[model samples]
Target: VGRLIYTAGGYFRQSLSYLEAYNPSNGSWLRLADLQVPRSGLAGCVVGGLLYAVGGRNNSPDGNTDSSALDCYNPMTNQWSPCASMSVPRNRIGVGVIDGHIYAVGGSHGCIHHSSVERYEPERDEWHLVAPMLTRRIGVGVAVLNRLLYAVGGFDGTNRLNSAECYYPERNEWRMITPMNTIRSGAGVCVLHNCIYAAGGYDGQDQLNSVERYDVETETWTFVAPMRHHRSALGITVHQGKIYVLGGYDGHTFLDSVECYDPDSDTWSEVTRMTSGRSGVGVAVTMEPC
Candidate 1:
């Protein structure tokens, strides 16, 4: 159960715990290194042995304040350094990496939803505009499988969306995928053995406890085992062949509980709780060195 997870700082105006990792093997939480700047609602992705933290709401409650600051972390040295800034400062964006490039997609620039897509070339420390999505959204879930990026459900300023889309970096384009069974925002998504799972988010009026899976090969959606508790802005990842759902908000309060879903059993079981409650925080795992 030993693994590395990445978390961001600043939630609800309180200085969040600086990028911490939990080692399940020893049952301890360790603070690695702090982000160059403190912000929340940011997105993160790990590619080619490095961690890229992308756009998020700036340090303010107004929501109009946003930033495009991109920071990268080197795990080997446990240090964080600046990278390229995004073309647009946004919050609640969906981020994914494909073919060594990071894609920042679909977030709001304060009051309006944005459909713009930006690609970050880490090697060059620069960003380039890519194909935009069909819909403007914020707080969407994203996952990559077989080099294709899937952008899932999110809020489009007016309402939570059931719509879903996929991006092909090779073609620099997007195609509408089958819509999700549930309409929610702030959900966490991850790829597992060719299937994509979306877990926990808000349905406009309330937090959701839903779990849904999309089969890439069949392009179909099926209801899966639901989480024990309702939550939004949760962190989800696949580790050791199981799906781990961590730290989110349950409407009135933040959650520190953790759960894992085993496909073989078709059920979910509670795991160890996180050290702190977090919503809209980032999560990443360490890949074996190539």
Candidate 2:
């Protein structure tokens, strides 16, 4: 089951632990094993054959803040177990899976946001601190492309940021990339056709419908067609060559809306909405590891 959890301002209700998985083949969702603990905020990616969920709040956002817990899920057994915890507690973290390692990037540490980075090495079931980002952020969007990781728009605890940075594993460092035309945070970001797309998000002023894209080859940011409504904390992923923008807050309430962009057609279209509204969502097309 693909799991999603939503909360106000990246904070949560100390909610339920139920889990669900989506079968893309039939386009249906079913219940699966529950998470070991309730969580809100974001960061998770596949490492080796298992999916591991990273930093986020455990109970509440006040006294109860970001959890150092690292939760692992095995689809084959449909079970969950705790792995090594990160060095720092965080929420709304950006994460990417590359080089067979799960890299957990910056996120908020309560009122303090961080640029600190850490990666989990399952070989020894240990976590290690990595090169820090030049840009400090929380509510950041991250994705992997061509073995490099991109840190997308984020809240710097000051401005809703438009800037982004890219990380090179070989060099073990980050460098600035072209900035987006629109400032945003809590946006859905993913790579498609080797290009990075940053969609609906909060732009400091308000929730936004504006979208921008960066082509790694040209290293340019092109403002793309906007979404149907303003949104933030949305789920984003690419499948079958299309970029899907899942449910998020449009500033009023949680949204059930979903839409996708086709690079070939350069168009956007509405899709089947979810039964319930959600934000701080997670999007993925369940598939075999092979």
Candidate 3:
């Protein structure tokens, strides 16, 4: 109930698919370990157990890009190691992990639209520089509770953005939250019990099955349950307490549907469906064995 791994396309040298896992009780799909550099608008998280795989857009398809590689996956030793890259080199970035570090938010550096912010100090494997996002995003959506760190909505290379920001690594500062009524870009964010949920995106001429909620102690935005399809670079997690949406891209197909949201009952169901059909992927949750 903590699994998702992707690589399917958004412009990059084709061939990719060898890291997949989604087992929410019985809606299964499995296979892991296989990514030695083959990317697509990537982003990932998983702190203590390791599975970084940050920034993305490599295997160039002539749009030449490579978001400063930083891959680290040890699903107990399926091995893959290399860290400390990203100083700038981005793709549609947004990632989180608070107490144990790892931030990386807002992206686009293939020619601007990036309010840079980095952090990732997994015991000094290094990467630091925070306090950036004021707006200037690209496919954003990130979350982290109590220790702060939330950045949502994206694409500022012209439009599609319903602002939202927060990052206070003890006041290293960045604040401006409460935006997201419509404008979207690659959405899928999670955090339950303490609120903060956002799903599906791409709202600039379609592709979005909107859903929103954020109330970290009344700094609000409510509106939930909208998603049967209409995705945008998806892969969201919150297992055991339920809330999973994976695989995205609906601007004319590329979606292996997998949706689940049950905040008490503000429903949305249609789970299990993913064998391939991706869009900007990378998701994590591991016990062992990649």
Candidate 4:
């Protein structure tokens, strides 16, 4: 991977226009163009050599509106343009990429929970509703592995969830899978070595530092090395066999701290911190040259 790009949200136009990139080789962040419609609680991922972002709460102090708007970024040109919106508005959503397509998983439009799933075809510039999840979710973690899309735990309106499920686009269906050891919402997630790594998240009762992974072959959830900080609403991206964890809340403080895990040695360590801090910020890695 070349660059880890991130955009800010919340507090009206103040932070909404902030877009930045992290250079892993030298560990430096440089600013980028501002998003047209600034938001908080948005979901983004890379597909077809570009970054696609989905719905998020309005950039307001009161956090009243939710958007169905979708935007795409071209790092080569350093510009962003609007794409097709989702079937319905949602914020705090989960996004995943597979087969050159993007999936917008569960999230909320205000107090309303959404199980309505949608898929985007970048070439066609169109979106179609897909199979719904077994449970409604907001702020879940989604990853693609071996052609299957997995939706990890999140808030289900009534409770923080430990339940996990997978969607087979080939079959056009969803299936319940093994759950995590701890309930989590806004945890950091990444796929390395075909294993889905689910890291620290708020466990309803507490912000957790525990890390776990789901083995598709075994259909089991197993523990990995925990992070040094109890992190929730953290952002994650992978590069050269390492999983980089970005800014998040550490139970006690809003953090600018950055940490990462190397599974080969099963270790976690602090890295360069961001210039500023925020929660529920979005992250994605680009294979494009830095």
Candidate 5:
């Protein structure tokens, strides 16, 4: 773990195993070890000083293959080692870490949508089933706030939803929270200023630039300033008080632009751009230097 932003395995026509890290201090990016399997929409998070790349889909000309594999990246060694797989294959899954355990939320395996939830214990190297969500969701966005895991809007098979929910690990249950103002699937979510921010996403009929913020204590959602470009399935993380949103698909094509939001000013500005366009990307922020 380090003070860098890591992104891995996203779609670019076919699935990609490319792993790259960005340093905010230097404004530079370095390639890292690729994933064992190329994947997109994988749930990526850091747990116990290790970066975990969870289940996603492997796309190719032949067909789309849903993956159940879980891989761990050790920054010190610059390598990835295979770990225990999830119970079911999934892509567009939402993930969050609480009490050192990685929780994988709802996503789809193919045509079927999932409401099931699971937690991974690295000590046991196993994933155990937890309480499922009240509603099925795919392309969901998740973040932990005050130890509660928040599951935000996504496609629930039939529609791009505006509903949201939070999981209480101690009680092993999920409770509905206030939904976002706009319907979103594949939105980017992160906790900032003691609140949850949901950015650009697809609204079934069109791509959206709208953004919203949720106040946990008040349990309410409010509109925030929108992004310059419409992005669905983008990668998001907070670094130095700014929320950075990375590449994703616009309505017409894949995007490479990177933007950051300033909560103090309620505005977004271009920060940097990726080398290539990508969608369905996974992003993680490391706490230490590699």
Candidate 6:
């Protein structure tokens, strides 16, 4: 695997089919093959050297249909091919890959929020239902820590959630984990320094710039340094010892900016902004194309 950051379909003016790759070292971006169908609120994860673009929804006057279509991008071939679709279509889906298996977590379909989960086997190109979460989550932030999938804060139909949970694939069970200090719907969650960080999101009353870190060993959530901007529906990933948060809406306006967090110093710094602002963006780090 080499250095390449990928951003697939997202919501800008409307749902986009664009697929672009960013080289962090050179600060350059290259347009790649577009998604077969346009969508937003999708999830992207790399497993077995392939980038998997998961569920999302399209915005159209005809119908805003949720998507279950899963697509795989091979770096060696520079092409995308269809994979098995999920059982239920979802938008704002949370996805993570563990031991070459991709898990599709909670999201919403139409007006319904979901607690259902499914796992995909790439070798067989098959997806099977897994245990569902205890609470429904839309725009849930998911990350894997020690081979377990953590589903962080998201909206649960009634309110913005501060609750979090983790999935034990071995037992096919979900157990409640310590909640975050701040209510964060559409927050960005990533693991760093053996701790899970939940960043800016909407807190029901207002957009949040606050951040919190979860210490798994102690089962405690503590407030870490906050981000400069209040961002909801942002994309976050760790690369080269730092955490990067991409564009999101700050309640009033959409953002085109990028921010980087250094765990060593416990700080956030400005990075090169994206050409256009995007919300509900999907970001993934993949191997450079040979």
Output the number of the lDDT-best candidate. 5
Mind giving the per-residue lDDT tens digits that candidate 5 earns over 48-84?
7788998889998878899888899988889899999
lDDT of 1 by residue, 1-290 (tens): 24576566636544253787765556567777777777777887887878777887755444346768888888778778888788888788888888898889888876879888888887798899989899887988988899999889999888899889999877889999999999979998899998888998988888888899899989999989899989898877767788888778897777888888999988988877776776777777773211
Write candidate 2's Cα lDDT for 45-116 as tens digits. 665556677776655434565767788777678778889888988778878878878788898877888998
Give the local distance difference test score of model 2. 0.74
Sort every candidate by TM-score, greatest first.
Answer: 5, 6, 4, 1, 2, 3
The residue pairs found clashing in candidate 1 are none
Comparing candidate 3 with candidate 6, which one achieves the higher TM-score?
Answer: 6
Tens-place lDDT per residue, model 4, 170-190, is 789999999898899988877
Per model, state how many residue pairs clash: 0, 3, 0, 0, 4, 0
What candidate 2 gets wrong by more than 4 Å, as runs, is 1-16, 59-63, 288-290
| Rank by lDDT (best first) | 5, 6, 4, 1, 3, 2
Worst 10 residues of 6 by lDDT: 1-10
- Candidate 5 RMSD to the correct structure: 1.4
Instruction: Please provide, for model 6 over 1-290, each residue's C-alpha lDDT reduced to its tens digit, 9 standing for 90 to 100.
Output: 55777888888878878887777888887888889988888888888778889999987666688999899999888899999899999899888888999999889998889999999999899999999999999889999889999999999889889999999988989999998888898888888877988999887878788888998899999887899899998888878878888888898777877898988788998877777888777888878886
Q: Which ten residues in a row have the lowest lDDT in candidate 2?
A: 3-12
TM-scores of the candidates are: 0.93, 0.89, 0.31, 0.94, 0.97, 0.96
RMSD each, Å:
2.4, 3.5, 17.3, 2.1, 1.4, 1.3
**lDDT for each of the candidates?**
0.81, 0.74, 0.76, 0.82, 0.89, 0.87
lDDT per residue for candidate 3 within 1-290, as digits (tens), equals 24443322333135243566566655666566677777777787788877777887765555556576778877767767888897888787888888888888878866787888889887888998878988888888888887788888888889888888888887788888878677778888878888788887887888888788888888888888798888887878776678778777787777777778887788889877777676677776655353
